[PDB]
Amino acid sequence: SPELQNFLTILEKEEQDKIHQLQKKYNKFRQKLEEALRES
Amino acid sequence: GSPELQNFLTILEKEEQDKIHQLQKKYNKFRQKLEEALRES
Structure with missing residues (x-):
């Protein structure tokens, strides 16, 4: 159903937003740690 | 080099991968349960 499609995409x-932000x-x-290590 | 760095990064x-798998x-x-709840509604 439509409700199913709406709710599953929500x-x-x-889920994807949380994983991608991690x-x-x-x-x-x-990246920052590698950059800082290259300083020394 | 740098084994020190990589040993840290592997931990x-x-x-990271544990958190992702947990999610x-x-x-x-x-x-699964959302699909069930909808059907039975």
Whole structure:
């Protein structure tokens, strides 16, 4: 049904947003750490 | 080099992947039960 499609896509967006923000947070930190280590 | 760095990062990677799997597990269950709840509504 339509309600099903609406609700499942809501859930998919919620899950994916949370996972991608974690991926971004870790990648930004690793990039910064690598950059800081190259200083010395 | 740098083994020191990589040893740290591998621990970080496991923490990250554990969090991601934990999220995936939760949302997979949520998906299942959401589908059930809708049918039975």
